[PDB]
Amino acid sequence: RKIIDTFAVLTPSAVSLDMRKLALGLNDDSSVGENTRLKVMQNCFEVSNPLHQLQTKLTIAFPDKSLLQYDCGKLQKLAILLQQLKDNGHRALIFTQ
Amino acid sequence: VTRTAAHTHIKGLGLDESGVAKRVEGGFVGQIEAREACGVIVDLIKAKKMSGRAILLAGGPSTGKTALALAISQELGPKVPFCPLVGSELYSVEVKKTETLMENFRRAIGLRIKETKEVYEGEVTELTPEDKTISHVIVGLKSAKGTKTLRLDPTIYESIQREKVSIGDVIYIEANTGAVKRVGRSDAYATEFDLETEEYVPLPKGEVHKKKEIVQDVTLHDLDVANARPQGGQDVISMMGQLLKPKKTEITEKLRQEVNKVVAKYIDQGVAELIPGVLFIDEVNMLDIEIFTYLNKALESNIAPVVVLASNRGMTTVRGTEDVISPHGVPPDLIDRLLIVRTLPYDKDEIRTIIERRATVERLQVESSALDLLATMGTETSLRYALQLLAPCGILAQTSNRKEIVVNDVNEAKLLFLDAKRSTKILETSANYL
Amino acid sequence: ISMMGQLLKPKKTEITEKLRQEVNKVVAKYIDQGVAELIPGVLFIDEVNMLDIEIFTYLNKALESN
Amino acid sequence: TRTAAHTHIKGLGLDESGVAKRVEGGFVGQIEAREACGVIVDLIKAKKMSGRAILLAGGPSTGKTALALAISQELGPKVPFCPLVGSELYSVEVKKTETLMENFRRAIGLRIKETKEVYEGEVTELTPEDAENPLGGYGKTISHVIVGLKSAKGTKTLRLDPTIYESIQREKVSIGDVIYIEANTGAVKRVGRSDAYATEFDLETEEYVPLPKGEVHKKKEIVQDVTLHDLDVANARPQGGQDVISMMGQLLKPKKTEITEKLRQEVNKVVAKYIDQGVAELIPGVLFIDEVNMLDIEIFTYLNKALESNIAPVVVLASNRGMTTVRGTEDVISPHGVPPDLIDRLLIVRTLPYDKDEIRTIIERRATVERLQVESSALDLLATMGTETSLRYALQLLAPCGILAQTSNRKEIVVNDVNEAKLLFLDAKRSTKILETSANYL
Amino acid sequence: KSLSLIAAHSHITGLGLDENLQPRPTSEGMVGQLQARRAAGVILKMVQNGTIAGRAVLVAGPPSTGKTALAMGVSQSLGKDVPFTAIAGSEIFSLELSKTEALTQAFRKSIGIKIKEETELIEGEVVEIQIDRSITGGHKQGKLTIKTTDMETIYELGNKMIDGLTKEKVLAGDVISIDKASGKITKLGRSVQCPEGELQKRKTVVHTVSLHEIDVINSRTQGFLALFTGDTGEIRSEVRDQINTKVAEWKEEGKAEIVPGVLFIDEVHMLDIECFSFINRALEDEFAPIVMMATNRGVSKTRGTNYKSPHGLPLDLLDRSIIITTKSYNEQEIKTILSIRAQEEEVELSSDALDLLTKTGVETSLRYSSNLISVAQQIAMKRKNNTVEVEDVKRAYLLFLDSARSVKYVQENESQYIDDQGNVQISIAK
Amino acid sequence: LKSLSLIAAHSHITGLGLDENLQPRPTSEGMVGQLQARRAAGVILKMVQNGTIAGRAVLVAGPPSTGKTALAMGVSQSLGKDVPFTAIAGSEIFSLELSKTEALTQAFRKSIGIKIKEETELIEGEVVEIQIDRSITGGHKQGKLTIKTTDMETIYELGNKMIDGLTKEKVLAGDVISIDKASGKITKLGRSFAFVQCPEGELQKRKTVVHTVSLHEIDVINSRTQGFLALFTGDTGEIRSEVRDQINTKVAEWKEEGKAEIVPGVLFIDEVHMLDIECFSFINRALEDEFAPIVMMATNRGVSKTRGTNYKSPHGLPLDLLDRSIIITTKSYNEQEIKTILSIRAQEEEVELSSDALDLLTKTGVETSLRYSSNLISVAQQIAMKRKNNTVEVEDVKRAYLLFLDSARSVKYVQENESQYIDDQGNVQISIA
Numbered sequence A: 001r002k003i004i005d006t007f008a009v010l011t012p013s014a015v016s017l018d019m020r021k022l023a024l025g026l027n028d029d030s031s032v033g034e035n036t037r038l039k040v041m042q043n044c045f046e047v048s049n050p051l052h053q054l055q056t057k058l059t060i061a062f063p064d065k066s067l068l069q070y071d072c073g074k075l076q077k078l079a080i081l082l083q084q085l086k087d088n089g090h091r092a093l094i095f096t097q
Numbered sequence B: 001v002t003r004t005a006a007h008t009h010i011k012g013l014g015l016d017e018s019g020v021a022k023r024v025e026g027g028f029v030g031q032i033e034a035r036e037a038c039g040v041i042v043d044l045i046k047a048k049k050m051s052g053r054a055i056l057l058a059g060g061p062s063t064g065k066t067a068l069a070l071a072i073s074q075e076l077g078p079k080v081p082f083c084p085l086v087g088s089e090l091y092s093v094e095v096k097k098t099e100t101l102m103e104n105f106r107r108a109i110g111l112r113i114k115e116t117k118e119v120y121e122g123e124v125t126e127l128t129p130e131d132k133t134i135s136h137v138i139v140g141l142k143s144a145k146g147t148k149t150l151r152l153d154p155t156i157y158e159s160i161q162r163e164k165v166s167i168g169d170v171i172y173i174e175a176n177t178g179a180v181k182r183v184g185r186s187d188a189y190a191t192e193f194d195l196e197t198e199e200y201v202p203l204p205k206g207e208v209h210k211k212k213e214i215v216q217d218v219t220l221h222d223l224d225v226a227n228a229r230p231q232g233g234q235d236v237i238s239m240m241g242q243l244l245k246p247k248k249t250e251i252t253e254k255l256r257q258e259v260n261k262v263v264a265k266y267i268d269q270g271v272a273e274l275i276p277g278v279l280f281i282d283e284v285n286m287l288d289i290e291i292f293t294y295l296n297k298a299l300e301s302n303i304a305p306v307v308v309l310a311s312n313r314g315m316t317t318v319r320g321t322e323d324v325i326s327p328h329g330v331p332p333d334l335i336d337r338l339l340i341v342r343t344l345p346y347d348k349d350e351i352r353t354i355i356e357r358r359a360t361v362e363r364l365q366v367e368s369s370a371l372d373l374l375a376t377m378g379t380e381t382s383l384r385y386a387l388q389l390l391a392p393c394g395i396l397a398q399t400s401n402r403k404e405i406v407v408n409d410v411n412e413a414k415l416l417f418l419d420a421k422r423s424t425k426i427l428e429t430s431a432n433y434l
Numbered sequence C: 001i002s003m004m005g006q007l008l009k010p011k012k013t014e015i016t017e018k019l020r021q022e023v024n025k026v027v028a029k030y031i032d033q034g035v036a037e038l039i040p041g042v043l044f045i046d047e048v049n050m051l052d053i054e055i056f057t058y059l060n061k062a063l064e065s066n
Numbered sequence D: 001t002r003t004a005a006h007t008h009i010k011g012l013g014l015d016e017s018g019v020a021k022r023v024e025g026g027f028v029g030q031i032e033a034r035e036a037c038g039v040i041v042d043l044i045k046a047k048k049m050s051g052r053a054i055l056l057a058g059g060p061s062t063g064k065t066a067l068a069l070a071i072s073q074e075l076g077p078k079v080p081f082c083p084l085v086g087s088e089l090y091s092v093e094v095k096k097t098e099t100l101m102e103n104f105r106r107a108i109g110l111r112i113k114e115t116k117e118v119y120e121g122e123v124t125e126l127t128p129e130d131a132e133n134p135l136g137g138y139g140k141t142i143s144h145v146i147v148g149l150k151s152a153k154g155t156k157t158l159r160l161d162p163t164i165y166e167s168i169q170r171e172k173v174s175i176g177d178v179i180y181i182e183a184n185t186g187a188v189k190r191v192g193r194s195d196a197y198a199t200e201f202d203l204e205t206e207e208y209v210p211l212p213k214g215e216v217h218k219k220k221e222i223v224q225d226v227t228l229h230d231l232d233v234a235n236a237r238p239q240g241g242q243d244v245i246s247m248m249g250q251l252l253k254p255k256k257t258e259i260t261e262k263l264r265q266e267v268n269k270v271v272a273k274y275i276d277q278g279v280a281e282l283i284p285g286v287l288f289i290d291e292v293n294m295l296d297i298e299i300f301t302y303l304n305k306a307l308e309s310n311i312a313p314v315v316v317l318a319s320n321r322g323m324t325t326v327r328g329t330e331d332v333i334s335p336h337g338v339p340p341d342l343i344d345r346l347l348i349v350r351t352l353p354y355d356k357d358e359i360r361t362i363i364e365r366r367a368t369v370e371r372l373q374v375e376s377s378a379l380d381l382l383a384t385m386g387t388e389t390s391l392r393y394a395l396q397l398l399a400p401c402g403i404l405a406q407t408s409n410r411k412e413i414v415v416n417d418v419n420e421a422k423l424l425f426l427d428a429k430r431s432t433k434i435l436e437t438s439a440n441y442l
Numbered sequence E: 001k002s003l004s005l006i007a008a009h010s011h012i013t014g015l016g017l018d019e020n021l022q023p024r025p026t027s028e029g030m031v032g033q034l035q036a037r038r039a040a041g042v043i044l045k046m047v048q049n050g051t052i053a054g055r056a057v058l059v060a061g062p063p064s065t066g067k068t069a070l071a072m073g074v075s076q077s078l079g080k081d082v083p084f085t086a087i088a089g090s091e092i093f094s095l096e097l098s099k100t101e102a103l104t105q106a107f108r109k110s111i112g113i114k115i116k117e118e119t120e121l122i123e124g125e126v127v128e129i130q131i132d133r134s135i136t137g138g139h140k141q142g143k144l145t146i147k148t149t150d151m152e153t154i155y156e157l158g159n160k161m162i163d164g165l166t167k168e169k170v171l172a173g174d175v176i177s178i179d180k181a182s183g184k185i186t187k188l189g190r191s192v193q194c195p196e197g198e199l200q201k202r203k204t205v206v207h208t209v210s211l212h213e214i215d216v217i218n219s220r221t222q223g224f225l226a227l228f229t230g231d232t233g234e235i236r237s238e239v240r241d242q243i244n245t246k247v248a249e250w251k252e253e254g255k256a257e258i259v260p261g262v263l264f265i266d267e268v269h270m271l272d273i274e275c276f277s278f279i280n281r282a283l284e285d286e287f288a289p290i291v292m293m294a295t296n297r298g299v300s301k302t303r304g305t306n307y308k309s310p311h312g313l314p315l316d317l318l319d320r321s322i323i324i325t326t327k328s329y330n331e332q333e334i335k336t337i338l339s340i341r342a343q344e345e346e347v348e349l350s351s352d353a354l355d356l357l358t359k360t361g362v363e364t365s366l367r368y369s370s371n372l373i374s375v376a377q378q379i380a381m382k383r384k385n386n387t388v389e390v391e392d393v394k395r396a397y398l399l400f401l402d403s404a405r406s407v408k409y410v411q412e413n414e415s416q417y418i419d420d421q422g423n424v425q426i427s428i429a430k
Numbered sequence F: 001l002k003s004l005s006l007i008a009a010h011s012h013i014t015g016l017g018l019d020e021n022l023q024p025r026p027t028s029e030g031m032v033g034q035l036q037a038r039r040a041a042g043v044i045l046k047m048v049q050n051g052t053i054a055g056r057a058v059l060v061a062g063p064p065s066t067g068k069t070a071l072a073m074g075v076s077q078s079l080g081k082d083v084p085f086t087a088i089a090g091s092e093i094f095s096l097e098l099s100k101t102e103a104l105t106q107a108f109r110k111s112i113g114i115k116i117k118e119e120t121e122l123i124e125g126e127v128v129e130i131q132i133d134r135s136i137t138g139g140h141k142q143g144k145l146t147i148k149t150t151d152m153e154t155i156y157e158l159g160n161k162m163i164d165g166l167t168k169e170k171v172l173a174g175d176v177i178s179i180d181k182a183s184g185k186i187t188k189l190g191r192s193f194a195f196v197q198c199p200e201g202e203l204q205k206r207k208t209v210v211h212t213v214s215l216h217e218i219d220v221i222n223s224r225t226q227g228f229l230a231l232f233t234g235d236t237g238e239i240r241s242e243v244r245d246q247i248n249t250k251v252a253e254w255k256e257e258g259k260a261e262i263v264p265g266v267l268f269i270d271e272v273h274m275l276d277i278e279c280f281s282f283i284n285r286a287l288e289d290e291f292a293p294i295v296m297m298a299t300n301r302g303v304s305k306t307r308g309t310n311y312k313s314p315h316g317l318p319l320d321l322l323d324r325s326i327i328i329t330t331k332s333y334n335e336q337e338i339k340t341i342l343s344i345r346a347q348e349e350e351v352e353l354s355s356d357a358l359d360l361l362t363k364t365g366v367e368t369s370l371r372y373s374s375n376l377i378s379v380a381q382q383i384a385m386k387r388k389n390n391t392v393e394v395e396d397v398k399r400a401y402l403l404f405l406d407s408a409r410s411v412k413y414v415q416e417n418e419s420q421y422i423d424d425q426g427n428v429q430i431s432i433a
């Protein structure tokens, strides 16, 4: 789960909605029976899949928690000097506007 | 620090506003006529008027064909799509060569759109089923600046049930595509348990409903794949639908024409703008005649973007043909629609300048004498070999602690590494097939 | 499962001789009860010269069948 | 009792630390060959060397394959031995390279032995034991659970921690039903009701097993062996009844997929982890490829890099042919069909044709396994025929002579019977001589 | 509509003709080629007549002379509502589909069928729609007000009609069209449009469907997806044998009609011999399109056989086809063609530049000069002058080499270029 | 720590064994002889360890029985951990489910890896006791326990999901466990008093965790939702090139942000003399990409014909590939060097040899091929094991010499008996008379 969580990025930029219902043939109007599509919809609503993580990760791109310091040029060399001052036994102040 | 493989010292064609090519610009020495005729092609692509035009450049090895074909891609800019391709890639086991050749033409024409998406976010207050058919669900999402309730589709309800959301957990719901994401449990419930594995996130700031517009660009073929095959979705029926036919299939001309029509209806609203691109094929001599003869008909089409070919050969037989002999391994009927750009080999001084600039971009110091030796090398063996020996000489200089290359180091590099001409000489006289 | 089995495109497959034999058995019974009547038919092949020697060889064993 | 061209070979037929016997295990002659293979048996029993291949060459009907069957017998049934043909490497499902790599990993087996203490028997009764809780409370507190066990010849009473009530509740056992309890791992397993309770109901859907024999407390060990390939297939293949991926397993078809190197190395990691603790034992096997002359040069090339692998087992090859053009290259000529670079990596074992006196003994030894007995006069004809026509011809004529003897009601073969069998069945040379005299296209 | 930038054939539209079928010297982007235009026109009127089917015709000629433009002008002159199929010879070769089935699929695609259906539709603005929950008195009670300019009336909904109005959210004040027989609602805009007239009108709906499109739907659960996805995968011949009879009965009943479309095959010389053997049988059947084939090559070897047949096609196929020959262009036609391309590409050429471009067009090829006419406009654009000049044509002539010049350069530079034997010299000296 | 290992030909060699000056030692780290070769390989070693250069090809040539394959093995061994090294045969790229060019790109993708690091807190301490609250058919449950360490004794309430985790793996007061807050995984070091002492230090500590994933894995993961299964099952084909073009940009952004660092690897190809021409034509262009792993090859074939073309190219490869590639040749072995190789093989297999048996084995090893003399040394011990003493004697080497035949010895035996062997034409004599 961890590797899938970190290394899944890309998204299918171009999609067509309501192509999923039409692919399986289950929709409001089709040649399939009326109750059969409902029973299939409930069976799919029940049975669970382990791949839901890859599914939800590949659908929407996740900012996660990690882009806070990676989108700021000042935060790139900040935590580094905070580690350097940490290992040297020093205290620091931060003044902002 | 900076990785350099046979490139990155070329920042473009380096042409002035009048079209005249300088002797030295952007990592380019000599080859003035080819850079000029190439810049003319650049302006032709920027004009967008021409379509289905093909220009091939024929020259000896090391003459800089490919290196010049990267400069036009650098000159067009990142906004213009460029599709590097090798003639050996057109052979595919899953789909026929013809479909793989036609596909790249659709991949070479980019189309940028603009669309607005609606976003809902907030902490969940109430969740109730309205329950044959899967009933809808009323969601109580609580924004920080307000409170709003919204009814949801049964499918997005299924995705919600699969995400194990609960009352008081911050979630994220996309309107158009129906995507569902959970950020985490609300920060106010952090004190409910002393030890729990679930992280706590603050309440999303702002209104529940938010909007914005995106300039996002999508290649035309990427838009065609969407209409051709289903794509990932959080529902199970989506995963089964995409898992029913994972193998790629050939697209009929009808679907392509319809997608083109809806593209036109998109450009009528002023939402999108269609721009062409450049298809580049390396080693065109490796193509079968079946791909050439299809290139005869495919270039006559109006939607076919400008394509550029590269081949280094003399008079040779076309692959797949028995008695047919034609220049550059291309059939004579296809060569008619093609325009040729000739390349010339460099002289000694131009080789010396090449090794100089490549040494400067590689960030390495070379003394004048060892530089002259590298030039003589470049004349007596090959241009690629002189550029190849540069790094080992610097490594030996690192072992000797010297900060500059010396004649002794490049001579030692000549002793340790051999070129093709020496190795063939060892091949002619040997015991058992060295 | 049967729904997705209907969704998948029909793909030709090599039919075993056992199933063919069973069909010949039930038809052989129905022709005995008189509920069914079997009639022969004619096969026509054009440009037979385009056939491989493999198909020509299999035609020898195919023509000897009842 | 079925015999096909074999089964008169029992082992190699060697002796203790010495030269092979003249006749042992149905083998006659070729003492040097089965001796040299006898050393290879020791090399395989050493379980040290890896990727060491050998090749036995010789003419047809010289006993090439019987030596491989013999060393296969000498290794024992526990040592894995995979018969394989060079023609089997070509498959439409996957590339030849993946099939060769798979067969290379089918040779090495892995043994697992486990000792577990068990408690089995009927249930005499179940009673809780109430004790004071560490922190005062009004409700009940159980310190232990007492479980009686009845088996044939013995009886016992046990005391368990109170956490057993969850497992007992899961197994739903109450009284008078035989259970299964593992000592350290714990919980329970319900095998079935006791046998004496079948009479109380005239009709019941539950079977009644008898009480366990012997003591109620037992300690037994079970050894299970699995090859590394069979282990990898289970790792690569999904397993579930109702799962969505498994749902796609149905209605679709499984096909052999090329296994990645990462997965193989991952299996090697856990196999090494279990072999370090002493629970696992790795025994290398033997791969055998008949008719290596049928292999393409692409497979011969992959054998060069494949034999240098660390876990690669010992593979024995057989090529009857002489100087030939290697498949895939028309100009190249190498002995036996094996390229010289591949010949460089192996050891050649020569085979010699059998003498007349050895042939007669071959037929007379085949008669015992055939259960048919022949006279001395008719045997002398089978010897000369065997030397002139071919060896496998006289061995092939044995059964028709016996059937004709049964038609004549005689229990032993006669010269007239071997002649009558000669006229009915023709060897290769006679047929090839008949083809020349006929213009019928025969 | 139909965004297109520039095509080779973008200028010629609909060939050209007169009521006497005699071609004009310059008619609708078609110059030159007198006899070829008359024969192609006879074929065109033969298609428009539709009395004869399953006939093959051959268009022969030198490269870049009056060949593809012919079939293009026939397809454009044929106009919309009639099928036209153009496939390359290399396109029928497929890994997933057999060559025979992929060859029959075009014959099924080139013949269309028109099916008409009559429906009664009620459309208009909705000012007020009331819908009530289930009560003991009746299942559901609702009244929708459909307002049109000529007449305004109120309808009481039919139960499941109420499920269609509640199924998709409908806001009062938008123009919709409700289908009584279909049972679905179609929204045409908001009140963007104006009510035309009476609410209910009887209209007929014509649907043009090819034989292939009918064939794919019956072989699959959903075949319309198999149309777009190209996964069709060798439909059974029995299904087609049923489609033909059902179409025959539809024709006898008068519920449908067939349109004899045209099938054009580019690069027929590269077709396999098996396909040539199948075409002979495919032409003699009842439903087949009129076939036109064009091959540049002649007296060559047929693919799949050792011997060389004339024109590159088997004689058995040549018997079934009628041959049309095209002639090389004269000097006076080339300048007019290049002038047509000049008017098409928005390129202004002086007469002095037209003379040089015509001379180069005669000395080398037409396709070349017609490529240069596009390139010179940018060299003229750097000079900022609106019209192209002779010097720009010469500069474009020296910058981009011709084929004949490039061959003569390769023959001298052969030592530098790679050779069939693989020999190359990348070293300058020694 | 130890992968499954048996005695192999490339076993003994570990590391390249080069001096800080890069000059080779006569005998070091299992390698003997071949000075210019090992030094030229060491220049490539420090070249990869530099990592500032990309897209370079090198070739190792020579006759059979060289150690060029051994040399590259020594480069992979001296390369060390954390640097990906991929070695594929030339006949491996051919595949029925995948294109040769696609699989060739798939080989280039596996060689370059990416390292990503992260920090996760950890709680490690002994348990005093466990208190859970449940109700029969009563839903909600409430747990509590008490964690103990030397300097800290505290009490933690149990969440809803912590209960299921503690019930999954049995937790006792005696058992000492270590649990991550974010991961929620329960890790049991072992058993304390009914053999590890109570953990020293604070109860809660934060330690960094590093994850390394190859470019190929990132490429396959993003193709499909079930594409993650293609990692282990190995079934994937025709990966979209747009996915690779996007992954390159995302990885470049990750490098600029400093989030993820890339580790350049080494690509090694064995038996490159047989390869399709489309593969070479694809390599020529593919070596010029920004991320190109360093490519080293091996060709033992002389002048011959390239597969896919009729003409014979020198060395077995087209000149276009020979241009940008560098050629490092190899030389044959001295009579003494063979003796040294056989001796170190005896040390690796742990087999004691007599001096006379070493001289005889060296002579018959020089007359014949080297690998054959290295083959006999393993059987000599088995033959001597029946003599009940551990030694290798000239008699046993002679017996092993008559038992196992050399190739050149078998060439004559085939040539005299050809009537018995099956001829190329198909004729064979199976009868003695």
Ligand SMILES: Nc1ncnc2c1ncn2[C@@H]1O[C@H](COP(=O)(O)OP(=O)(O)O)[C@@H](O)[C@H]1O
Pocket: B006, B007, B027, B028, B029, B030, B031, B059, B060, B061, B062, B063, B064, B065, B066, B067, B068, B312, B354
């Ligand atoms: N005019 C030039 N200036 C600088 N470098 C050049 C020039 N022409 C060629 N090169 C160098 O030569 C190298 C190989 O040339 P390439 O384009 O691969 O030859 P080919 O087109 O024959 O394949 C490139 O890395 C490029 O940097």
Ligand SMILES: Nc1ncnc2c1ncn2[C@@H]1O[C@H](COP(=O)(O)OP(=O)(O)O)[C@@H](O)[C@H]1O
Pocket: D005, D006, D026, D027, D028, D029, D030, D058, D059, D060, D061, D062, D063, D064, D065, D066, D320, D362
């Ligand atoms: N030592 C032996 N004693 C008796 N029969 C033998 C002996 N060696 C081989 N055979 C006979 O040879 C046959 C196997 O021959 P085989 O090795 O398959 O021929 P090839 O060498 O062509 O493979 C067996 O049926 C067996 O009866």
Ligand SMILES: Nc1ncnc2c1ncn2[C@@H]1O[C@H](COP(=O)(O)OP(=O)(O)O)[C@@H](O)[C@H]1O
Pocket: E008, E009, E012, E029, E030, E031, E032, E033, E061, E062, E063, E064, E065, E066, E067, E068, E069, E070, E296, E337, E370
């Ligand atoms: N009669 C014509 N009128 C105008 N242009 C023509 C004519 N014939 C050929 N062309 C020109 O020739 C080009 C294509 O030639 P084409 O007919 O395709 O030759 P072929 O079919 O032999 O390959 C088109 O750009 C078109 O402008």
Ligand SMILES: Nc1ncnc2c1ncn2[C@@H]1O[C@H](COP(=O)(O)OP(=O)(O)O)[C@@H](O)[C@H]1O
Pocket: F009, F010, F013, F030, F031, F032, F033, F034, F063, F064, F065, F066, F067, F068, F069, F070, F300, F341, F371, F374
């Ligand atoms: N310098 C060396 N040090 C140790 N062993 C060597 C050396 N050179 C060659 N060898 C031996 O050569 C054997 C294999 O040679 P190899 O290089 O595989 O031949 P090829 O070049 O035909 O592939 C190995 O078992 C190895 O022990």
Ligand SMILES: [Mg+2]
Pocket: B065, B066, B282, B283, B310
């Ligand atoms: Mg190139």
Ligand SMILES: [Mg+2]
Pocket: D064, D065, D290
């Ligand atoms: Mg055999």
Ligand SMILES: [Mg+2]
Pocket: E067, E068, E266, E267, E294
């Ligand atoms: Mg044409």
Ligand SMILES: [Mg+2]
Pocket: E280, E281
């Ligand atoms: Mg006919």
Ligand SMILES: [Mg+2]
Pocket: D304, F069, F270, F271, F298, F300
């Ligand atoms: Mg090798």
